[model samples]
Target: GAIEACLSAAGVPIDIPGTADYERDVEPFNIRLPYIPTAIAQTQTTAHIQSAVQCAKKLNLKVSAKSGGHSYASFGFGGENGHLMVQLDRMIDVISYNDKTGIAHVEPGARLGHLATVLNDKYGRAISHGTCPGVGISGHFAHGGFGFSSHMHGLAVDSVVGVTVVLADGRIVEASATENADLFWGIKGAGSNFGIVAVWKLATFPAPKVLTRFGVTLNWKNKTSALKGIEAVEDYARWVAPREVNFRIGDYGAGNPGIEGLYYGTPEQWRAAFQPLLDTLPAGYVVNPTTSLNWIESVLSYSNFDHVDFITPQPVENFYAKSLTLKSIKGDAVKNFVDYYFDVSNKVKDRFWFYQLDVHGGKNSQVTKVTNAETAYPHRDKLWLIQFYDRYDNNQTYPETSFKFLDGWVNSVTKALPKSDWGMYINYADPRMDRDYATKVYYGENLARLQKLKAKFDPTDRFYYPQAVRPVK
Candidate 1:
C-alpha cells in the first residue's frame, strides 16, 4: 500500500500488516474503521489533507483521525481491534496570527503549550486552553476546552471561529457559523465522530502581563475538619461569584490532603479576592505566590509543568492517566464522596492517585443564548465538576489494580451522587458505563443529532472509537 510505503520511507512503523489486523485491534474499542497515514506534512494543512486522502485510497481504507490520544473512552485514538491510526502529532503549526484581531489559524495537532508560546512570541496574545500542556488544542477545543481563563473568555469552543475538516468520502471542507452551520455546531463539541479536524481558526486575547498564582493548603485532621474544609471552599466559591474573580480551588483527598487555591489577575486583585478565604483559614498555610512571565507560564505553573521543565525541546515521557467527573449538590455530599474516595485510596495505598474538587460556579452557570446542550456535553448550570485523577506507571504492578480501584470508586461515587442529566465528562468516561448511560453522559438529546451527523459524514461508520456517538441503526 502507498500508505505503508510512505510510512516506511518516513521511518514510521505500522503495527498491522493489513486492514484486518487494524480492524481487530480497534474492535474492542468499537472503532468503526481506521486508516494509517504515512509522512504527515509538518506545517501545510492542504498537504496533510491530501496525504491522508491518498494514503486512505492506496490502503483501500477510510481515514480515522487522532490528536493527543486523550479522549476519556478512547474516542480520539481507536478501539483495541478495528482501525488504522492516523496520528496528527507532526502537523502542529501556528499558521498565522493577528494581534489586532486577537485570532490565529492553528494547525490541528498544536498543543496548548505550543499555542501559548507562539502567540506570546509573535502576537503578544493568549487563548484560554486546558491546564495540561500536553493536551492537544484541536481535540480539546472541539470538546469544549475549559481552563482558568474560561470564566472570563468562555470555553475554547466559543473562541473557535472556523475549522477545516476532512470528511469520510475524502473531501476537505471548511466550516464556519455562516458556511456550514450544522457542521460547525457538530464540530464545536461533537467533533470526534464528524471527521478529521485539520486546522482551527481560533479567537485569541491579549496576553496577561503577569499572572498572580496563589496556592493554599489545609490539613484534614478528621472527618469534621474535612467536611468543614469542603463547606468552606464551596461557600467561598459562592461568595466570590459576585466578585467575578478568576479563582479555582483544587481540593485533594487521602495521600495529599489539602486545598490548592489559585486566583488569576493582578497581584492586588488576587490579594483582595483571596483575603476573605485566607482570613478564616488555619494558620501556617503553605502558600506559594509567584509572578508568571506570561499567561502561558502561569498555566505551566498551575499544571505543575515547571517542576519537570517540559517547556524544553527534549522529549518528555508521560504516564498513563485517567480522569472521572461527578457533580455534587452541596458540601455534605462533597464530604461524603471525599470520604469514600479516601477510603478507596487507603485500600490501594501503594497506588499513587489524586482527587481534584474544582469549585465551579460563576459564569459556568450562566446560560448562553446559543442553546446546544442537547448535542452532548450538557452540564451548563452545574455548581462544580469533581475530577478523580489517577496517574500510575504502566510497567508497575499497580496498573491493573489501580484501574479496578478507580472503576469501582467511580461507580460507587456516581451511584451515591444525585443523578444528573449527564453522568460523566466525555474526556473522562469509563467503558464500564452502559450504552444508554454513556450516550447521555456525553451527548444528551444531541445524541440523536450526533448520530445523524455521524451517519451523514461517515455513513460506513468508518471513524469511531469506544465512547464516541454511535450511528443509530
Candidate 2:
C-alpha cells in the first residue's frame, strides 16, 4: 500500500498482483524459482528508477531491477518474494555513439541482439557479448558476458568504459576509470548488490568483415575415444589456438558430441588452424561444410534468430544449470567427465540435457590479458568453462535426484582438483546454492573487495537478493 502511494507521488506507474503487466513482469526465463515481488515499477527513465529506489529504501522494502527478466534464479524478481521490482524494458535505447572514441552509450534495458544490430548497421562497430539475442544487457554486462568474439575482444564487462549508477541512497553518480572507480570495479561483475546501472558506456571496435562458421559431430566408439577427443581439443585450445578462433565442445546426449563455433578469419585461415585438432580427434567423425557470413548474418546464425530487430524475450523454461571454470583440465579430468556422462548421467532416459565446454582461457585469450584486480570478474586465468544444463519435462515436478545428477557431473572433475583451481560462473547461476556458497564460488578472491563495496554503497542492503553480496560489518 505504501509502495503504491510513494510511487504515485513520484509519478511512477506501479503494477500490483493480478495485473497483466505484473503477470508479464514476474515471469522469468528460468521458471524454476518463482519468486514474486510486492510491486513492479514500470520504469522508463532514470528519474523513475530513482523514485522507485527512494521509495523502497524509505519503506524498508527489498528491490531488484529487471531488464530482460532472464536471470536463471530470477534474481530480477528479488530471488525471494516481496521485493519491489523496477522493470526497465521500456528503457531500451542506444542513447548515443561517439565516433571519435568509438564508444556507445547504451541503456540497461537494451538486449544483446538489439545493441549488436544497431552498432553494426549504424556505426560499423561491435562489442564482445553473449550470443543469446534476447538476454538483457544489464544482467549480462553486470555479470560476465562472453561469446564467440570474446576471445578476441575480451568479456563484455571489459568493454565498459563508464556507467551511470543509482546508488542505494538514491543518489545518481557516474563510474569509470577516473570517477567513482571503486564502484566501477564492483559494478563490472558484482553490480546488482551495489545499485541500478541506468546506463553503460562501452568501448567498441570495427565489426569483422566476415567469419567462418564450423560444426563437426564426433561419433565416439566408446568412452576411450571420447576422452581422447576431449583431450585433443582441450590441448589445442589451451596451448596453441589463436585468439581469432572461438569454439566449444557440445554434448547433447549420450551418442552425440559435437564441436560448433565461429572464427573471425576467412575459411582458409580457419581450416589451417583447425586441421591439426581435427586430425587428433578420434575416427568416425563427421565434418559439416563450413559457411562464410558477414557480421550480422554470423550473429543471427549463432543466436538462431531469424532477424535481430524483432527478437523477443526467451520463453520460460524449467531448467537447472551450473558452471565450472577450470585453470587446467587434464586427461584425468576429461576421462572423469566422459566416464560420468556415459556411465551415470546418460542412463536416465527421461532427462533432456546438454553440456558445453567453452574455451575462455589460453595463450592468446583476451580474457586473461587483463589482471584479476582490474574488475570484479575473477575467472580470467581459467582455461575452460564447462556448463551442465538439464531441462525437466513440462508440468513434471523437478525431481530431487536431478540436483545430484548435475552436481555430480560438475563434481566429477572438480572433486579431484584443488578448490583454488576451479570456481563457478554467476551467469549460469544455480538457485540451489546458498548465499555463502554462491558468493564463495562466484566471486572467489574478489569477494572481500565486493563485500566492502557492498557495505560502502549499500549499508542498508536496499538491493537485496538471496545471493547478493552481504555488506561487511
Candidate number achieving the greatest TM-score relative to the actual structure: 2
Q: Which lDDT tens digits does candidate 1 get at residues 24-69?
A: 3232121212323332322235555555555555565645565655
Screening candidate 2 with a backbone cut-off below 3 angstroms (N, C-alpha, C), the clashing residue pairs are none
Count of clashing residue pairs in every prediction = 18, 0
**lDDT (CA) per prediction:** 0.59, 0.87
The residue-by-residue lDDT of candidate 2 on 77-105, one tens digit each, is 98888999998877788899999999999
Model 1 misplaced stretches (Cα beyond 4 Å): 1-44, 50-62, 72-75, 242-244, 247-255, 279-293, 306-327, 363-376, 397-399, 434-436
Q: List TM-scores for all candidates, in order.
A: 0.81, 0.97
lDDT of 1: 0.59
Model 2 stretches astray by more than 4 angstroms:
none
Q: Candidate 2: minimum summed lDDT over ten consecutive residues — where?
A: 305-314
